[PDB]
Design an enzyme around this catalytic site. Structure first.
Site, short mmCIF file in Angstrom:
data_model
loop_
_atom_site.label_atom_id
_atom_site.label_comp_id
_atom_site.label_asym_id
_atom_site.label_seq_id
_atom_site.Cartn_x
_atom_site.Cartn_y
_atom_site.Cartn_z
N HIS A 52 0.91 -1.14 0.00
CA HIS A 52 0.00 0.00 0.00
C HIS A 52 0.98 1.23 0.00
O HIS A 52 2.00 1.19 0.73
CB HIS A 52 -0.96 0.34 1.16
CG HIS A 52 -1.97 -0.70 1.45
ND1 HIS A 52 -1.66 -1.84 2.18
CD2 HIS A 52 -3.28 -0.79 1.18
CE1 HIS A 52 -2.75 -2.57 2.32
NE2 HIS A 52 -3.73 -1.96 1.71
N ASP A 80 2.36 2.12 3.22
CA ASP A 80 3.04 1.03 3.90
C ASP A 80 4.54 1.39 3.75
O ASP A 80 5.23 1.18 4.73
CB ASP A 80 2.82 -0.38 3.44
CG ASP A 80 1.45 -1.00 3.54
OD1 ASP A 80 0.84 -0.76 4.63
OD2 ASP A 80 0.98 -1.69 2.61
N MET A 115 1.79 -6.29 -7.49
CA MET A 115 0.50 -5.58 -7.25
C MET A 115 0.81 -4.44 -6.30
O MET A 115 1.65 -4.57 -5.40
CB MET A 115 -0.54 -6.54 -6.69
CG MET A 115 -1.83 -5.91 -6.23
SD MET A 115 -1.82 -5.19 -4.60
CE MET A 115 -2.19 -6.55 -3.50
N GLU A 126 -11.61 -5.37 -4.66
CA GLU A 126 -11.73 -6.36 -3.62
C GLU A 126 -12.94 -6.07 -2.76
O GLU A 126 -13.01 -5.15 -1.95
CB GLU A 126 -10.48 -6.29 -2.83
CG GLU A 126 -10.34 -7.14 -1.58
CD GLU A 126 -9.01 -6.90 -0.93
OE1 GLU A 126 -8.04 -6.43 -1.50
OE2 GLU A 126 -9.02 -7.21 0.26
N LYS A 177 -15.74 -6.96 0.13
CA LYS A 177 -15.78 -7.17 1.57
C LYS A 177 -17.13 -6.73 2.11
O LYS A 177 -17.69 -5.73 1.69
CB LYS A 177 -14.56 -6.54 2.23
CG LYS A 177 -14.45 -6.97 3.66
CD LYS A 177 -13.32 -6.52 4.49
CE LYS A 177 -13.29 -7.09 5.88
NZ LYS A 177 -12.35 -6.27 6.68
N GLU A 204 -11.26 -12.46 -1.52
CA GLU A 204 -10.32 -12.87 -0.46
C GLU A 204 -11.05 -13.92 0.34
O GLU A 204 -12.26 -13.71 0.58
CB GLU A 204 -9.81 -11.66 0.26
CG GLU A 204 -9.30 -12.03 1.67
CD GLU A 204 -8.59 -11.07 2.53
OE1 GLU A 204 -7.86 -10.17 2.13
OE2 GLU A 204 -8.88 -11.32 3.74
N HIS A 259 -13.10 -12.73 3.54
CA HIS A 259 -14.14 -11.79 3.15
C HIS A 259 -15.37 -12.56 2.78
O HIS A 259 -16.38 -12.40 3.48
CB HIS A 259 -13.64 -10.90 1.98
CG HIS A 259 -12.59 -9.94 2.51
ND1 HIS A 259 -12.22 -8.98 1.56
CD2 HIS A 259 -11.79 -9.73 3.61
CE1 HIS A 259 -11.31 -8.22 2.10
NE2 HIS A 259 -11.04 -8.68 3.27
N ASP A 295 -6.45 -13.24 -2.98
CA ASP A 295 -5.85 -13.09 -1.65
C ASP A 295 -6.34 -14.29 -0.81
O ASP A 295 -7.53 -14.53 -0.66
CB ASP A 295 -6.13 -11.82 -0.92
CG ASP A 295 -5.55 -10.51 -1.33
OD1 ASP A 295 -4.69 -10.30 -2.19
OD2 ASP A 295 -6.06 -9.53 -0.70
N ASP A 329 -12.72 -9.94 11.01
CA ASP A 329 -11.70 -10.36 10.02
C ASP A 329 -10.54 -10.94 10.85
O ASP A 329 -9.89 -10.20 11.63
CB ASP A 329 -11.49 -9.19 9.07
CG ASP A 329 -10.49 -9.34 7.97
OD1 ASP A 329 -10.11 -10.45 7.47
OD2 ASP A 329 -9.99 -8.29 7.44
N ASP A 382 -7.80 -12.95 9.60
CA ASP A 382 -6.56 -12.92 8.79
C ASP A 382 -5.56 -14.00 9.23
O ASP A 382 -4.38 -13.67 9.49
CB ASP A 382 -5.92 -11.52 8.84
CG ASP A 382 -6.63 -10.49 7.99
OD1 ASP A 382 -6.92 -10.73 6.83
OD2 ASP A 382 -6.91 -9.42 8.60
N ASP A 402 -2.65 -12.58 2.07
CA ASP A 402 -3.05 -11.34 2.81
C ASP A 402 -3.69 -11.80 4.14
O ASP A 402 -4.89 -12.01 4.14
CB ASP A 402 -3.96 -10.44 2.00
CG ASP A 402 -4.38 -9.16 2.71
OD1 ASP A 402 -3.94 -8.89 3.83
OD2 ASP A 402 -5.17 -8.41 2.08
MG LIG Z 1 -7.16 -8.41 0.99
#
Ligand SMILES: [Mg+2]
Ligand SMILES: [Mg+2]
Ligand SMILES: [Mg+2]
Ligand SMILES: [Mg+2]
Lengths: 393, 393, 393, 393
Positions: free
Chosen positions: B52, B55, B86, B179, B181, B215, B218, B243, B253, B255, B291
């Site tokens: 990102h 980031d 990406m 993406e 969600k 994802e 998601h 993802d 979420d 992850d 991710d």
């Molecule tokens: Mg993602």
């Protein structure tokens, strides 16, 4: 708060006729004769009745029996003036549709199922229905390996495009509405939500006459916002029909009366069907169809009570939503919150992407911390909607 | 079961760099330097790294700081050979994006957000990224009245089509992946699932270069079958990125590491990315991007363990899924169950809808009770997949 | 609908003081000085204020700082007249608590967590709090092998029995309230629902002064009926406190204002708290505490607005729930549905099992199908209730 | 992986005998004669069979019919050697039970339901069953005003205490197992989760011979961790029976084969049942009972196949869970994560609260940030576990 035929309340024959068999028990009510159903609904203020082919005509029925049933039914419609705005096919009850109609792993069942549909389109035209609903309830799987996922979609497309081409060919003024559902009876159903349904139609050859039939409960079974999915369908000009009932959470399909599930949500649903969008846009002017089930604990008085309840709930929500939008406090709260501001395009007329990148006031010299200080005042605005809902304003 | 760069395992900088702040507590790990991140991932067998904008480059950073950061980073990529497949933009962290980027009720925030994106597309091209991901995390509402639902979609379309037209104009070989969600951080997000996302792209003017980035977690947050939603994206030729992580139910979420949520599902996900469709069709040959977030209970040894785990899990699932499909018992179980039969068109070559209606053997003289007797044998077939999964065959 | 101190509306310092940081972003609001919170809440009609030790006193506070802060806060209480009915311990934000307080796998941490609680009991007693709340937010795991589950419950009991023993020893009149929560921040939390908290209490040495603090959104995160839950807590006379808010489904915790979630369930919770059980039984008399968070989209006007929305929501529901039970039509509908009939004991005065089994009329010659004809009319009782909810009747 | 009677695999008559009717369709299979079920299950390795009174003896059976049926079934048991370890009462399919058995609003029905249970205790005792299961499937409501919630729990207690009193009186060695379930067929069911059933048991006069029958899918329908639930039941020594199956999320009850749902949770349930708690404690020794339903898509070969899949699933998990705990690498990982460290009491031998609070090293001079550096390494323990699950190590 007395319904009348310009309200366009339509009821399915299977709703009031649902005798009460669930997966843990037998029917608790006697069968409802369909002529009696038409007479009782006309009298309550319904505009129309809808049915599944096998709701009126038994699977087994001989041609004579079909003629006899349809004659009495037609007589009943004539005596009352009830229209038949939507027709649909039962592709889920008989053991033959254990793996689907259209996406049945067995090819002979897919041909039978598609022929069950073409015959039903002919009956739909004959009745003067404008919408042909397709609920693919047994199309899916319980196991990830049961299907070839791409083939299922090709088989589904084939079915749907053959039916659509046949409407076109015969010149019927009928549209097809697909009704998405997450699960039940299959553990996973194909085209589980409004977007899958919507996405699916853009891959069809005869997409132009194919739209959706979202159902309150169905989206709610995947934890989605019903108002936001119909908004998107409307936005795309694909909201061809609508089924309203209630649902209390992610669990089995409850099929309660509209307003007996998620009330605040029911309220904003009714604000969108009735009032549309705040800045203007599309409106939905089709029938308001109730696809629910009168709770099995109750006798026939409860069935008619439940039918009345659906229309009452919709009318109570409608007045509250009309007062809400008319309210000048609400209009200025909407203004503060930026509801109308969202209506303005992001770019200026004639502005290009390069123009905005390079505009120092939109990026380079943009004060993001000052901009972050804005009080959107969404809670207050939420609070005003609920006070309108509670009939306190 | 030693990963290598032709495996195409890509990792986001925010995953391993996630220091542990959740909504109930502070970070539990020290910040991870991005040069160190690149060196540590290259060494584990990663093919690429993604990030990102914020980031790598602080929101505040002056041009000199941006030059300095990017120089070290580029050096690191050069020293290691890691690609950057990406790139994506942070449109959700700074207080200014409290109501969204693109669908922000404030028009000045929508222009800032779209300019944050155009600048990032330029950096994405520069890095040689083929995909530009757009996660609209703050676009939605907590209250049904917060937005004009149609305007949100017009504002979202505007944003996305301006960005797509700008790729086209500059000649970048970049595709946009949206993406979807369901929720979090907003209580309802626009384009909550793969179909909403898919449907949405068909209304765009520059739809041709817009696809998806589904994802695991998601879809699982709305209780959907991840394998069936990627199947549909693939089917439509819109699976541009993917993802992978894990999720245990409808809740926040999580992850987790891919394979640490829904294992059987992870398995069939890997069978579709690796083996494709049983009767043939599309295949996905892009990167396998992880991710996820290394659990906050664990120190840095756990971060690298967690990164290794992602690739290990995918390779274990891959061998089990290759043996499974190669297995002759499995191929004949697939045959019995009608997996290949679904591949056959429903209609005969040249058959018309009228032809099938009127074909007595497909409807009128079809024996539906005999046809219902078929043993699909889906359980046995499910059972064989799990025995392959358990490494018992 | 103007709240007065007599209403017993209590607010946590953490609620109005929540600055807006969530997992995807930073704070959108400035820190709230506690003196201002106290003053603001007293001008709105709050009866009391509650806090976590670190809401007031920073983790690293020196002794001099601690006394200043308490001198400031005690002064404010004195000036405004607010009470402090509940005090709780933050055993969740500092990184030391990543695996829990009381059920941390590390024994040194379990000792510090319990020390931290004992010290906080002194503080709570000093402040005049009647309830001591224990929320084990970090008590759980992401993974099934992370914990020895019988050892986690032994550790949990040790902690709670040590704290209760200490209260008894010191002669403080404090009661412990455990606050069950299914997930977030851990993937699965120990003592997930009201049911689980109640069962655990009965395994405690000092369970007599240990009860529950059910929170509306926590139970809705498992799909449970909030009203059934507190009814069960009430019935076992273990409802020591209540935390009221809103939750729109199974997703992250929202912490919306009370009635801004599931309206109808909110309506029925108010009815139970205000009107008690239809046939009589225990009633709840503690504070009506609000543990919510002002949406991050809203500035400080939004914060005082949402604090006021809790109290207006509740007062509007209370008015409707009082009107509802007083309606003669509703009282009649209730009789008809068998609501009072559930209050009559099944057996007769001194009837034994054996007497019941051989009684011919209760079994042997009991006409089961005649009995099954009873129309319970639950849809009509439900419809009356929503009609009172909507201010329609 | 060949089951033997020593394994204690028990099956309900209703499971293999489920004919396929669901809410959307009719039976796809013919009725299973009970004699054949017994013979078939004994050839597969079943240890016992369980039934509901009406699975065997029809509701309207004459006396002559009842004895024939029991002569047939007792003969079959005798011939094959199968045991009947559990018997239950159907207080759900007949329309008399639309509002419940024990908590029906109608008092005449509560009397019949309890009479029906007492008679069934005699039968269960006659058959040599050790466990009497009570599943209150119709105990609940769709609507919050349908029931007086304190009166429903009083009625429920009366029923359970009457039945337990009767057992004690008659000297039968039977234990009652309550089976909690959150919903379906009612919208909300009384005693929704393991937690709720355990709490209720402690309010009972004869709770000493009253325990639980947790079912895997029931707990997953609330999003609960099945393993945490039975651990809590175990710890309170109330785990009297267990019903094993599969569930793929919060949706209708699926009743898939055990391990055909959430695999990893299945793996951890087997581990707990087989290996007990890491630090020691109570162990489960009753039947491993399977309450599932052969998918309706499958013919009778599918039925015996799925009965065998339960037993193979379990034996494969058991083998992996035994390999898992015996691995030295796993034993080491567990030590490292503090799994055995949770077993050490928090306080020291004869340490008081007061002693702990003033100990400088446990609080005052405790270095909280040094303590927080511990890498608990739960991802790596989780990764080892999945690796043993996949037959990789
Ligand atoms: Mg993602
Ligand atoms: Mg429908
Ligand atoms: Mg709370
Ligand atoms: Mg069961």
């Amino acid at each position: 708060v007395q319904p009348t035929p310009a309200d366009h309340f339509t009821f399915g024959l299977w709703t009031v006729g649902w005798t009460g068999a669930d997966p843990f028990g037998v029917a608790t009510r006697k069968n409802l004769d369909p002529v009696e159903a038409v007479h009782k609904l006309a009298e309550l203020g319904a505009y129309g009745i809808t049915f599944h082919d096998n709701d009126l005509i038994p699977f087994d029925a001989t041609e004579a029996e079909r003629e006899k049933i349809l004659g009495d039914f037609n007589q009943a419609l004539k005596d009352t003036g009830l229209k038949v705005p939507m027709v649909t096919t039962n592709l889920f009850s008989h053991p033959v549709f254990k793996d689907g109609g259209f996406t049945s792993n067995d090819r002979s069942i897919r041909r039978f199922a598609l022929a069950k549909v073409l015959h039903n389109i002919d009956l739909a035209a004959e009745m003067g229905a404008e919408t042909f609903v397709m609920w693919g309830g047994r199309e899916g799987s319980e196991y990830d390996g049961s299907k070839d996922l791409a083939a299922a979609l090709d088989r589904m497309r084939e079915g749907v495009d053959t039916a659509a081409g046949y409407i076109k060919d015969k010149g019927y003024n009928l549209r097809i509405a697909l009704e998405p559902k997450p699960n039940e009876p299959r553990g996973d159903i194909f085209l589980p939500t409004v977007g899958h349904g919507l996405a699916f139609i853009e891959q069809l050859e005869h997409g132009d006459i194919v739209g959706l039939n979202p159902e309150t409960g169905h989206e709610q079974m995947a934890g989605l916002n019903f108002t936001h999915g119909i908004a998107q369908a409307l936005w795309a000009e694909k909201l061809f029909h609508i089924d309203l009932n209630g649902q209390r959470g992610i669990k089995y399909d409850q099929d309660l009366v509209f307003g007996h599930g998620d009330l605040t949500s029911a309220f904003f649903t009714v604000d969108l069907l009735e009032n549309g969008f705040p800045n203007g846009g599309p409106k939905y002017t089709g029938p308001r169809h109730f696809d629910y089930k009168p709770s099995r604990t109750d006798g026939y008085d409860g069935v008619w009570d439940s039918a009345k309840a659906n229309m009452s709930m919709y009318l109570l929500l409608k007045e509250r939503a009309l007062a809400f939008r008319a309210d000048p406090e609400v209009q200025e709260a909407m203004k503060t919150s930026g509801v109308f501001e969202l209506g303005e395009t992001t770019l200026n007329a004639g502005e290009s992407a390069a123009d905005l990148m390079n505009d120092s006031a939109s990026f380079a010299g943009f004060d993001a911390e000052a901009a972050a200080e804005r009080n959107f005042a969404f809670i207050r605005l939420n609070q005003l909607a609920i006070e309108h809902l509670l009939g306190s304003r």
